[PDB]
Symmetry: C2
Subunit: 185 residues, 2 copies
Amino acid sequence: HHHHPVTPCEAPLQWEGRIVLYDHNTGKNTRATVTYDAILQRIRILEEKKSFVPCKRFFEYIFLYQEAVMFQIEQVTKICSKNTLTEPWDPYDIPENSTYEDQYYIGGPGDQIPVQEWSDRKPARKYETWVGVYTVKDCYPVQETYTKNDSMTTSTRFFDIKLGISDPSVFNPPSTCEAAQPLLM
Amino acid sequence: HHHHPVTPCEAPLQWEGRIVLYDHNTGKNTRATVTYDAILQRIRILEEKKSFVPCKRFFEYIFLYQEAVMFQIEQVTKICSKNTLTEPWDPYDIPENSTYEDQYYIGGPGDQIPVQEWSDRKPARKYETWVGVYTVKDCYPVQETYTKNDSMTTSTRFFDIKLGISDPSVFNPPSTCEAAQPLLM
Ligand SMILES: [Ca+2]
Ligand SMILES: [Ca+2]
Ligand SMILES: [Cl-]
Ligand SMILES: [Cl-]
Ligand SMILES: [Cl-]
Ligand SMILES: [Cl-]
Ligand SMILES: [Ir+4]
């Protein structure tokens, strides 16, 4: 008998890593290099081009939540958009009041890792809007599903995570962002 | 005035590296990981698959010139061919009697490398059948063009070369080569 943990582990506050964003609404899998900083509430997201995908435009996003602004740079053409942020900062961590779902091992004999699953499950709602899988040892994000705001659901996978920000230069918006608010999409 | 060098540098005898084979006769660019051993006169060549090339079969070649045999393994299906070698061993080096052509730098200010060009040029023949480019410092192969045997010409580029054979296991033919001489092509 293992004690149901009273609160979730604390996710790391700063890291450089890579994600896949699976958007169910359009079926698109966006691959990205991420710089994540829950202390200054900024996140920088660089989309990746793969061989022979049939879209031609790739974006860098710099979310600066402490200055209420997001910059979106078309990577090739360097066209920059500057937009106001209305929405609060949302960390990649387990909220304090989350429901404990389970603990299990991912992978094989010898090469396997213990992880935990948390959710926002509560008896009043049939369906969860949030599920997070996090390592037991270091509380690193592994996967999140997020059903939020009338039924736009995303699935995020996280990998190659490295504690710390070895390159803070990425949060400086480029010279071209003396700029306006386009919808680039 | 630099003295015309009396003999070419001596190419390294053993290395692991990668090549591109450009065959003019068919236009095909074959990318390969190579294990090269001029002492035991063996060479092992592993073709590389790239995303969405329209051929489906990729070969490992183990040339054992000291036992007069070559093994060709279809990589996925592991079908093995065992063939006799009639042809003598040919090293990746500059033959002793080669004509000196030139010395120059490849690349830019700060990031540039000095290399030499040798050939089999002689006044009796209008066209060279062999041209080799080799580093000045270490005599590493950079590029060869080979017009030999009625006008089948190949161009080879060499890169990521590492002195020594850190993995001799590659010269052991697989369990499936209790086997016969197919033409796989
Ligand atoms: Ca969150
Ligand atoms: Ca040769
Ligand atoms: Cl790719
Ligand atoms: Cl790739
Ligand atoms: Cl590829
Ligand atoms: Cl690739
Ligand atoms: Ir690729």
